């Protein structure tokens, strides 16, 4: 019973402190200080620093879908780096309700879904939890509790034909509001009155979809803003998305992807 030194420097008094340090039975072992096989090594293994998430195939794409039928994508088994937040390109907005993007890197998440669509300039606000408008009633509805990140930017040059890009449409007339994240892609004839018109688009029967008028010589308010909505969820098996962290060798204390586990 010789050689018990002072592990730390924090002044303690009359508090029994269990400590895991190197002592003489030098070897690692745990001691109780008065004022069973011990893990001989600690190893950590995170996914290799390659194989990044296809943020390009979501942000830099040829065509985004219309808002009535948005495009949903699931990215997983990648080391996501969140360098998008820097305005490397034009980035009008960056909201990130519920989770801090700055400190987001250190955490390990599950299947961050990305939703992409094109909307008009005024209505970008309506993509928020607790909005009431044509977009957030019949086209795309956000849950009351949201843990994601709304990204919107302007691209006048790609979406404004001098004739007019009329290929972008949205749903105007619907029977009832949309449950969170429900896509209702239909081309029925809305019965706005007691006229059984059997799909003839006559008096009191309209067509729900209606095009968007886009012109380069137009105001900022009526311009095409492309939007992408990152949605982070976490349930089980977090061995999917995991922020970049270095790893060690494999042989004990273990830390695998944040009774059987598959080494990434």
């Amino acid at each position, epitope marked *: 019973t010789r050689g018990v030194y002072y592990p730390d420097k924090v002044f303690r008094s009359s508090v029994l402190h269990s400590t895991q340090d190197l002592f003489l039975p030098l070897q690692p072992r745990t001691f109780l200080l008065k004022y069973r096989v011990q893990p001989t090594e600690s190893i950590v293994r995170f996914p290799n620093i390659t194989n990044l998430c296809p943020f390009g195939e979501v942000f830099n794409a040829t065509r985004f879908a219309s808002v009535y039928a948005w495009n949903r994508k699931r990215i997983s088994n990648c080391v996501a780096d969140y360098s998008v937040l820097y305005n490397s390109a034009s980035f009008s907005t960056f*909201k990130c309700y519920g989770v801090s993007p700055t400190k987001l890197n250190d955490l390990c998440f599950t299947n961050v879904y990305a939703d992409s669509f094109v909307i008009r300039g005024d209505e970008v606000r309506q993509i928020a939890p607790g909005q009431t408008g044509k977009i957030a009633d019949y086209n795309y509805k956000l849950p009351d509790d949201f843990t994601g990140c709304v990204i919107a930017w302007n691209s006048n040059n790609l979406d404004s034909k001098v004739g007019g890009n009329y290929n972008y449409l949205y749903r105007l007339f619907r029977k009832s509001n949309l449950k969170p994240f429900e896509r209702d892609i239909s081309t029925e004839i809305y019965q706005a009155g007691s006229t059984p018109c059997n799909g003839v688009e006559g008096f009191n029967c309209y067509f729900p979809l209606q095009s968007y008028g886009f012109q380069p010589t137009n105001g900022v308010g009526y311009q095409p803003y492309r939007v992408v909505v990152l949605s982070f969820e976490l349930l089980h098996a977090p061995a999917t998305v995991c922020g970049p962290k270095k790893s060690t060798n494999l042989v004990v204390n273990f830390n695998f992807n944040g009774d059987a586990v598959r080494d990434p």
Partner: antibody, heavy 119, light 114 residues
Framework: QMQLVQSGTEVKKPGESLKISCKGS????????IGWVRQMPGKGLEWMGI????????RYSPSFQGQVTISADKSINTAYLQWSSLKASDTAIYYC????????????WGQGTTVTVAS | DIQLTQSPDSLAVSLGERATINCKSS????????????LAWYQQKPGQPPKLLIYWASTRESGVPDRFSGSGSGTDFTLTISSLQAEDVAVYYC?????????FGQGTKVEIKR
């Protein structure tokens, strides 16, 4: 981590109009929701308001709702807290603190500017 | 809209002794989606702006020494200083950041004893 530098100390007589600036310097300042907090002498903090630079969405507190005005200027990355007619009870120290998102703890705090109203 | 409460107001302990501070909330501040308590602990020294200490009521910010620990669940949360030192005498605030407006704690003053 982008630091915030406050404008400075102002002494004013009752009945004046007062504008206080919070200046944000540093990289990554694309998502920082600026908020204001007032500390009366030797008392606890009391949160006042939160504004997003740019979009300018502004959320207030019920006690202070409409007493003061919080505005933001995006081009130079600044936030302004303005009193139309400050009274004699406004002598206190004000801190501007910037969160990284809605529902995120405030981690970067400006030095803070005292205000004195008296003869 | 959800007022908080702290206890005790003033606590005196000797150097190297434990220090427990309790924060009580009106309603549970647990976010269903991520299952993380939304509540933070702040330290303020006389004459300086406050500093973040604990966020999510269980995780420590970078550089904070191990001595400071945060625990609790439901509505009851506590901050424990395993061994107090000569630099920790200060005022501690518990803040909930679930929904606006963000209420603050009364503030607890930690002083040493002779």
């Amino acid at each position: 981590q982008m630091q915030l530098v406050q404008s400075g100390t102002e002494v004013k007589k009752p009945g004046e109009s007062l504008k206080i600036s919070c200046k944000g310097s540093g990289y990554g300042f694309i998502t920082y929701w600026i908020g204001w907090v007032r500390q009366m002498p030797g008392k606890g903090l009391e949160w006042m308001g939160i504004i997003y630079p740019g979009d300018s969405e502004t959320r207030y507190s019920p006690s202070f709702q409409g007493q003061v005005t919080i505005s933001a200027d995006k081009s130079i990355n600044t936030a302004y807290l303005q009193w139309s007619s400050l009274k004699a009870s406004d002598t206190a120290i004000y801190y501007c603190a910037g969160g990284s998102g809605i529902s995120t703890p405030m981690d970067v705090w400006g030095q803070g500017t005292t205000v004195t109203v008296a003869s | 809209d959800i007022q908080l409460t702290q206890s005790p107001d003033s606590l005196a302990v000797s150097l190297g002794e434990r220090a427990t501070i309790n924060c009580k909330s009106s309603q549970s501040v647990l976010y269903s989606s991520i299952n993380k308590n939304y509540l933070a602990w702040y330290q303020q020294k006389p004459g300086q702006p406050p500093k973040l200490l604990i966020y999510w009521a269980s995780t420590r910010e970078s550089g904070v020494p191990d001595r400071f620990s945060g625990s609790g669940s439901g509505t009851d949360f506590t901050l424990t200083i395993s061994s107090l030192q000569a630099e920790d005498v200060a005022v501690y605030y518990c803040q909930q950041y679930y929904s606006t407006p963000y209420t603050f704690g009364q503030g607890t003053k930690v002083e040493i004893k002779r």
